[PDB]
A paper describes a structure:
Two mammalian homologs of systemic RNA interference defective protein 1 ([name]-1) ([name]/2) are suggested to function as double-stranded RNA (dsRNA) transporters for extracellular dsRNA uptake or for release of incorporated dsRNA from lysosome to cytoplasm. Here, we determine the cryo-electron microscopy structures of human [name], homodimer in a side-by-side arrangement, with two distinct conformations, the cholesterol-bound form and the unbound form. Our structures reveal that the membrane-spanning region of [name] harbors conserved histidine and aspartate residues coordinating to putative zinc ion, in a structurally similar manner to alkaline ceramidases or adiponectin receptors that require zinc for ceramidase activity. We identify that [name] has a ceramidase activity that is attenuated by cholesterol binding.
[name] embedded in a GDN micelle exhibited the 2D averages of relatively resolved transmembrane helices and we successfully generated a reconstruction of hSIDT1 to an overall resolution of 2.77 Å. The lipid-like densities were inserted at the cytoplasmic side of TM region. These densities were fitted to cholesterol molecules and Mass spectrometry analysis identified cholesterol in purified hSIDT1. The two densities run parallel to each other in a small concave formed by TM5, TM6, and TM7 at the intracellular side, which can be modeled as cholesterol molecules. The putative cholesterol density which is better resolved than the other (CLR1) is located on the opposite of the homo-dimer interface of TM5 and fills the space between TM5 and TM6. Another cholesterol molecule (CLR2) is packed with TM5 and TM7. These cholesterol molecules were surrounded by hydrophobic residues, most of which are conserved in mammalian [name]-1 family proteins, suggesting that the cholesterols serve as molecular glue that stabilizes the conformation of TM5, TM6, and TM7.[name] is previously reported to bind cholesterol via CRAC motif16 characterized by the sequence (L/V)-X1−5-(Y)-X1−5-(K/R)25. On the extracellular side of the TM helices, we detected density that would be assignable to Zn2+, being tetrahedrally coordinated with His563, Asp574, His791 and His795. In the cholesterol-bound form of [name], Zn2+ is coordinated by the conserved three His residues and Asp residue, in which there is no space for a water molecule which is activated through the coordination with Zn2+.
Author numbering:
A (entry chain C), B (entry chain A): 44 to 275, 283 to 332, 444 to 528, 535 to 648, 681 to 825
């Protein structure tokens, strides 16, 4: 039977009958026409469904209405409205116009008969345009896909999909032009690149990875939300999701060289400003072998994760900030690796400042008027700043749950090395072995990895950790040891307020909770050392006084950017994608990349406080005050 | 048109016609009947394929003949013979006999017409029997699946699939009874448990994980071999694979307690035999903090791999010996973990022997006639034997490429600690710090992980490693240092023969190649120490003479079982499954589990040689010979 588009056909079909509708149209040699088939059936007899077969010249497509889904824990779902878009055949100038037939056959095995309703339409907004937002609606029985053609200017696009409600859970997939299109639950992750999505998604593509410089963008809704965060609305027989897709061209290669030269010439401006004021006046092996032995678990691991996300299309592994992930060859986020250049550049500059202070100290001993200068741990800290950037750049190749500590765990060593040197400046009788720096670092990683996994924010771990936190502060207070007893009980109250804050709220990101312990204890013992210099008759020279004000304004700026989370391994990867944000600096760097820039500067100026604070006493002779 | 089973129907179909065959049969209320549909088409016009639709009461099934496949690097394959088995509806005593209809519709859009051939048969050997081997043949366009029903006796079965040729690459899947059965390339890994397979497969199942105590065993052949080892025969239009499946009941729970009590009472017999001869006569903290800091990368990792293989059905991750993998709760191979009990039991016994020798040494100093007894590294070795079993049991939770070293890497530390104590017995002036045991261990792990990955068996790594191996032996020879010069050049020739053996063959398993360096250098310097005692006038007491003969017969037995590989992370998981073997001891332990038993005994008796070799000189007074 010859039928018409945009007309709703209704009928009844039983075991003897089979309705056949033949649809006939013509494809123009430049535009593309997509056909969608709508089938209803308001028949709840689920022992005799309505079977619908759609035949084309080169394909056959079949489904049953009502569509059935088997969820977890033995739950069944019905869907009385099924919609499928047939794979379009594109006519070109080598072919001309093409007359195409489509046969739709409706059949059922019910003895009494089953009622249905059929509608076949041509899609008008099938081809997506560049930088134009397009709104549509999908369903677990009504998947959608659209076409995007690459312009000759653009070589890389980003597919930004936005939804204002977290549920139903969905899948956004990118596939080839070659038929068939996989738009069902069991085949959408077969080939192509896909992402799970509750509220946001972002897929970055290259023009060189597609033959005809075109792809399909497939939208499939899931019947349950177990792959996403939740589980299982006024009689939700249909799990409709309102989506909005925008295809934005990526940044050009001039942004790759303008932003990379920024991240070098900013930290090389520290080199020029250091040798200028040098012109005006005109254990490290131990910490590297801790670093590279702690590192090699992730080099053996993140090169497998970065390949699995590339040889498959499973982009649910590596937890990036997908709205600010700029690839370079194999790496999928080059800006997260390039932003750690400030650690290895300012950490190398701090070694050249100590080496200038060490050569000009041995040349003065060949020809007492100060505290004994010990440049041992100063070499140990500038190395530890350099190894912090190497460890965290390896984390950002594929951030996930199995390497989460490697963003900031080596900063516990840096904060531990700073509090030991500040104790060493007026207690030179200490002797910390190279094993003790390895063993005390190994027990603060263990309790971190455990807290996040086993602790799993339960009250059994948080109480006994709060007891460890309050007796550690009670041990270091009298070890440091009359206004001396006044400061040594204020600093316990800051650690006690820190202990009960994590006890009543239980922050799940325990690796960032351990940073707050090591930073505030650093910024208290450094703050108590200045007040002890000012309660005595000791002034502050303008060179350390600049570095104290610099340390306070760079740590307050870095701790602001530290709290804007743009990714989270704590939940599902679709839950982490809801917090993705665009780049805010030079269209290359997000909030987490400025934290890599400003925590390498705040730790550098914290080093320069510990080096030049006691240069008041380099003219005051010894046997005066300790 | 009413049609008959086991009859070949042939016809021609064009755009106007559509042949319809109706098949009618009856299902008995205890047996099960499966229907298979065979379609040929010897028409190479691939612009107008033959479309075949099979309609049942509750399902619709469609495909096109010739079937098309898109391989990697733009290769297309045709298959002119397609065969599908329809999902059977089981009749029970609550239903009685069931009259079932099957409609087969053949259609094509060719203008001239397309020829086909149709055959519809009932499967006779559809239900698999227990402990009966069954041979069949499959194809990439002709998948197969069968039914297995659990007996009331059996609670766990193993599905052993055997093929005598490695190619074509295949997939063996286990699925539920609820229709549809996923037997195509794009849906066979959707739900259920699956395994890739070239030559062998073994899937262990529980009765409690299936609702009706029955499952389907799906066999799907792949169009290419890229997921397996190879790639892409006399005009192989069909990639036929001859398979053979056997379903064997698992071992009972009495085997779980008979084999576990064996592995305790054997190593507790060493305790009873030690205190009996004690009745006849009637740095460790440093090595644990090396161990648990080296361990915590895998506890954060293998608990994710063991869950992913459980929450999905991807059994291509954990590289077990699947023919000797016996589960216990969450773990999928309990015998690989239980076999490491000999390390923690014989390592704890060695500490109690040294502690008995240490308490009876301090009690003798309160009341010279020997070499100075130093029990420092003796505590360090018995701890290192205990931590070797903890590290390798964590490896066998999920062995793969990301944790491969943790089977045997801590034995490099054990062999290194033995060669240092044997140097210490007649050179007591040595002072090896606790950091130097950590730093020298960290550089032999680095060069191992690298050799396996980057080295990747290329000549650029193997030449420069052979140069490191020959100057290390040239450094330790004169450090040990006239028949003394005779032995110190024979031991270089064993290291030189070891250097060129790995250079001309390039063993890819470099972690086992590093074991051969550390073991032979241990078994040479221990062998040279006995000859130096016998070239002088020093006898051997019967207690160390028993332990020397015990060390030689337990290391020769353990190195035999070390070379029978039953798994390999070097290739694809389907390539590793070809080397799986059945258990040889108590139906619980394979060849790799006896290596865990005999290398904990050979290392224990190697400890007892180093402890009691110099008990000749405990009656000879000092100032006699060094
Ligand atoms: C397939 O054949 C058609 C028919 O020739 C091609 O369409 C033609 O494309 C050219 C190039 O874009 C058009 O020229 C343009 O005309 C506009 C005026 O509208 C002018 O402003 C531009 O500067 C340019 O000269 C031409 O009008 C257009 N003709 C028709 C009838 O559409 C088409 O490009 C061919 N496609 C391929 C892939 O070869
Ligand atoms: C299968 O059944 C469903 C529901 O019975 C049909 O959906 C209905 O579609 C019509 C036409 O698109 C909708 O009517 C119009 O809706 C707009 C938007 O709300 C409204 O502004 C108009 O005044 C008009 O009522 C109708 O609302 C919609 N029903 C629901 C519940 O959303 C569907 O069309 C059926 N499929 C076929 C092939 O017949
Ligand atoms: C569904 O109904 C049929 C019909 O009764 C059941 O078949 C019957 O099953 C019993 C138990 O296995 C059979 O008894 C056995 O007979 C053999 C002699 O062949 C004897 O050696 C055994 O000791 C036992 O007594 C019985 O013969 C058999 N009857 C028929 C006609 O097959 C069937 O078990 C029912 N299924 C379910 C799931 O309830
Ligand atoms: C589609 O075409 C293929 C090949 O043209 C058909 O396979 C052929 O099936 C027949 C009957 O099963 C085979 O004949 C018998 O084979 C056995 C085993 O070799 C032999 O011992 C007998 O003497 C007899 O020849 C025939 O060998 C086989 N052809 C090949 C190349 O294996 C298939 O049956 C066709 N499908 C339909 C539905 O007609
Ligand atoms: C359902 O099947 C029956 C027979 O199995 C058919 O019923 C038709 O009913 C109309 C109205 O009474 C009459 O023309 C005949 O009794 C039947 N027509 C034919 C052509 O057999 C029919 O196949 C189905 N009924 C429908 C589609 O309404
Ligand atoms: C689909 O519709 C078109 C018309 O839109 C049909 O084309 C006509 O075909 C007849 C017979 O070949 C010609 O006499 C007419 O002149 C054609 N009209 C046009 C506008 O081209 C076409 O045949 C239809 N397809 C089928 C399969 O029937
Ligand atoms: C192919 O289609 C044509 C028409 O499009 C039909 O050809 C038949 O040929 C036979 C033998 O010459 C004659 O009975 C008629 O010319 C046609 N029969 C009918 C019923 O139209 C037929 O549909 C197809 N040919 C086949 C199946 O052989
Ligand atoms: C399938 O075949 C069976 C016979 O094997 C058919 O059963 C017959 O049905 C007619 C009409 O209802 C009865 O008069 C006969 O007595 C039945 N015979 C038997 C042996 O049961 C059955 O009708 C067929 N199915 C269809 C849909 O035609
Ligand atoms: C902070 C971590 C990550 C890095 C390691 C630095 C800290 C923890 C290390 C380095 C120097 C070490 C201390 C040096 C000296 C002493 C005094 C001794 O009587 C007990 C151990 C103790 C107290 C050491 C253990 C902890 C210590 C303070
Ligand atoms: C994070 C680390 C660096 C903690 C900072 C404190 C370090 C640098 C200093 C501060 C006070 C010091 C302690 C002061 C007093 C004692 C008691 C003495 O019998 C052994 C050393 C010991 C235990 C010192 C170890 C090092 C120490 C703990
Ligand atoms: C074998 C590995 C895995 C475990 C570590 C044990 C070995 C390698 C360690 C422990 C004792 C160490 C040696 C002890 C003393 C010396 C002499 C000194 O002048 C150079 C370093 C050197 C040579 C040390 C480095 C290597 C050494 C032999
Ligand atoms: C795997 C490890 C234990 C190697 C075994 C050899 C160890 C135990 C012994 C054997 C000979 C020893 C060396 C003999 C001579 C020297 C030269 C001296 O100026 C420094 C120590 C040094 C370098 C010794 C270090 C320890 C040493 C290397
Ligand atoms: Zn970071
Ligand atoms: Zn092992």
């Amino acid at each position: 039977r010859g039928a018409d588009f945009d007309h709703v056909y209704s009928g009844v079909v039983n075991l003897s009958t089979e309705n056949i509708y033949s649809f006939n149209y013509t494809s123009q040699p430049d535009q593309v026409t997509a056909v969608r088939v709508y089938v209803n059936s308001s028949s709840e007899n689920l022992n005799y469904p309505v079977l619908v077969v759609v035949r084309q010249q080169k394909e056959v497509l079949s489904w049953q209405v009502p569509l059935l889904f088997q969820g977890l824990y033995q739950r069944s779902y019905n869907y009385q409205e099924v919609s499928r878009t047939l794979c379009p055949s594109e006519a070109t100038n080598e072919t001309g116009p093409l007359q195409q037939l489509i046969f739709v056959d409706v059949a059922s095995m019910a003895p009494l008969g089953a009622q249905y309703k059929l509608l076949v339409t041509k899609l008008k907004h099938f081809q997506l345009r560049t930088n134009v937002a397009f709104h549509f609606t999908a369903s677990p029985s009504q998947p959608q896909y659209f076409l995007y053609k690459f312009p000759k200017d653009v070589d890389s696009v980003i597919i930004k999909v936005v939804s204002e409600m977290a549920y139903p859970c969905s899948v956004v997939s990118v596939q080839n032009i070659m038929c068939p299109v996989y738009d069902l639950d069991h085949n959408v992750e077969f080939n192509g690149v896909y992402q799970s999505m509750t509220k946001k998604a972002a897929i970055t593509l290259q023009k060189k990875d597609f033959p005809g410089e075109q792809f399909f963008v497939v939208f499939v809704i899931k019947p349950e939300d177990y792959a996403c965060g939740g589980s299982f609305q006024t009689w939700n027989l249909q799990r409709k999701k309102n989506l909005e897709v925008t295809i934005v061209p990526s940044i050009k290669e001039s942004v790759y060289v303008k932003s990379s030269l920024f991240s070098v010439f900013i930290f090389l401006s520290f080199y020029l400003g250091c040798l200028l004021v040098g012109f005006v006046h005109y254990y490290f092996w131990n910490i590297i072998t801790i670093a590279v032995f702690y590192a090699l678990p992730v080099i053996q691991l993140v090169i497998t994760y970065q390949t699995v996300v590339n040889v498959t299309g499973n982009q649910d592994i590596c937890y990036y900030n997908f709205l600010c992930a700029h690839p370079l060859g194999v790496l999928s986020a080059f800006n997260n690796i390039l932003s750690n250049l400030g650690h290895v550049l300012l950490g190398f500059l701090f070694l050249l400042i100590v080496l200038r202070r060490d050569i000009l100290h041995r040349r003065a001993l060949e020809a007492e008027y100060g505290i004994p200068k010990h440049f041992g741990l100063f070499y140990a800290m500038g190395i530890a700043l350099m190894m912090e950037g190497v460890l965290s750049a390896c984390y950002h190749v594929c951030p996930n749950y199995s390497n989460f500590q490697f963003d900031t765990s080596f900063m516990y060593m840096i904060a531990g090395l700073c509090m030991l040197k500040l104790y060493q400046t007026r207690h030179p009788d200490i002797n910390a072995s190279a094993y003790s720096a390895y063993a005390s670092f190994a027990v603060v990683i263990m309790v971190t990895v455990l807290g996040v996994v086993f602790g799993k924010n339960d009250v059994w771990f948080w109480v006994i950790f709060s007891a460890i936190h309050v007796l550690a502060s009670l041990a270091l207070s009298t070890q440091i040891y009359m206004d001396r007893m006044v400061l040594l009980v204020v600093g316990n109250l800051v650690n006690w307020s820190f202990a009960l804050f994590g006890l009543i709220y239980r922050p799940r990101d325990f690796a960032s909770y351990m940073l707050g312990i090591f930073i505030c204890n650093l910024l208290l013992y450094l703050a108590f050392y200045i007040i002890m210099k000012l309660r005595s008759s000791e002034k502050v020279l303008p060179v350390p006084l600049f570095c104290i004000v610099a340390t306070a304004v760079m740590w307050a700026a870095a701790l602001y950017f530290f709290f804007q989370n743009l990714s989270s391994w704590e939940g599902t990867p679709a839950e982490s994608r809801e917090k993705n944000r665009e780049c805010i600096l030079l269209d290359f760097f997000d909030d987490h990349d400025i934290w890599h820039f400003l925590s390498a500067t705040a730790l550098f100026f914290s080093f320069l406080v510990l080096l030049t604070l006691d240069d008041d006493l380099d003219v005051v002779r010894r046997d005066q005050i300790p």
